[PDB]
Design a binder for these strands. Structure first.
Ligand SMILES: [Zn+2]
Ligand SMILES: [Zn+2]
Ligand SMILES: [Zn+2]
Ligand SMILES: [Zn+2]
Lengths: 80, 81
DNA sequence: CTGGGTCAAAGTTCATC
DNA sequence: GATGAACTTTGACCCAG
């Protein structure tokens, strides 16, 4: 079931992931970012629009928005 | 399931934009859609699109991508380099 | 009331022309 | 700039009280 919306990009959501209502895309993205301790950089103004269509344009801005909406790095477990 | 590109007959590398196709036809469809490129056929819009002559008519290669089922809706926005 | 995993099919890269 | 073989990321769908 996906009755709520993603706080980061506005796509559909099953509910909270890492503390925030998010879609499978934003969940996966935050998980991988944290697991591999990735660092991104914005080529524009560090204010890129994050919606379903544009969410992959800028990883840096997608990641800042994950944090801004409440996703917590501590909620990502170690790899099994 | 097929290992032949439905557009040009070269070995396909998997399904791309809805059609079993090669990396060449995938790449060409992606670029055409992303950049809104329009081509013109020099002959009569019926050029042979095969592994060896696929680049000899962009108009006919693109029309064949569409005819074989490639979907423009499956090409996404360009990401940051 | 959300942790985990996969891998098809999206993506980009860059040597070669 | 265009191409295409090789390389990387995404996210829909599945697992589990
Ligand atoms: Zn999202
Ligand atoms: Zn940005
Ligand atoms: Zn082909
Ligand atoms: Zn032609």
């Amino acid at each position: 079931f996906t009755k709520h919306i993603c706080a980061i990009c506005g796509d559909r959501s099953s509910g909270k992931h890492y503390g925030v209502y998010s879609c499978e895309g934003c969940k996966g993205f935050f998980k991988r970012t944290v697991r591999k301790d990735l660092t991104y950089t914005c080529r524009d103004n560090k204010d890129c629009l994050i919606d379903k269509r544009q969410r992959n344009r800028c990883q840096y801005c997608r990641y800042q928005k994950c944090l801004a909406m409440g996703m917590k790095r501590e909620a990502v477990q170690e790899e099994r």
